[PDB]
Amino acid sequence: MKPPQFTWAQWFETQHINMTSQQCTNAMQVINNYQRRCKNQNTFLLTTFANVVNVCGNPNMTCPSNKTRKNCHHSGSQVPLIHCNLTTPSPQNISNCRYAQTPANMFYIVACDNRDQRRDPPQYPVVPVHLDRII
Numbered sequence: 001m002k003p004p005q006f007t008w009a010q011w012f013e014t015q016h017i018n019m020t021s022q023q024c025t026n027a028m029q030v031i032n033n034y035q036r037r038c039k040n041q042n043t044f045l046l047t048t049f050a051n052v053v054n055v056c057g058n059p060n061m062t063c064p065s066n067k068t069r070k071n072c073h074h075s076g077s078q079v080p081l082i083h084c085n086l087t088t089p090s091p092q093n094i095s096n097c098r099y100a101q102t103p104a105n106m107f108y109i110v111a112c113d114n115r116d117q118r119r120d121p122p123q124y125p126v127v128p129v130h131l132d133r134i135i
């Protein structure tokens, strides 16, 4: 999925933090144009990248999606978020994909890892790399 110019942290930011429009159909064009497919579901967290990095500092927990991974972290508090769901596919013209939008206030669990040594900025040695669950 992930284009080669992005670190996993930059991809996380692109998929889940930088909602470029408050409208799902428009915001999703960015993700979809990058991955060359209309993503079926996607959550944007209405929080800051710095706040998610802080969540990486919360206690480690098992990742809901993988019982073998212990690099997950619970947000502690709820945040506002928007879930985008594909309503109108368009695999031969990605730009014509349309989405529904669902606002909610929920907890989240992220997986974090050490930053990309060559490409992530040194400011944040530990970065979110995957949104594992919304609760």
Ligand SMILES: Nc1ccn(Cc2cn([C@H]3[C@@H](O)[C@H](n4cnc5c(N)ncnc54)O[C@@H]3CO)nn2)c(=O)n1
Residues within 6 Å of the ligand: 001, 002, 003, 004, 063, 065, 066, 069, 071, 072, 111, 112, 113, 129, 130, 131
């Ligand atoms: N260019 C490429 C190269 C490979 N892939 C496959 C791929 C897809 N993923 C996603 C999850 O499998 C992976 N992931 C899930 N759980 C965890 C976890 N506990 N800790 C670190 N990461 C996790 O994070 C990625 C973000 O959703 N990772 N690799 C790709 O899509 N594009």
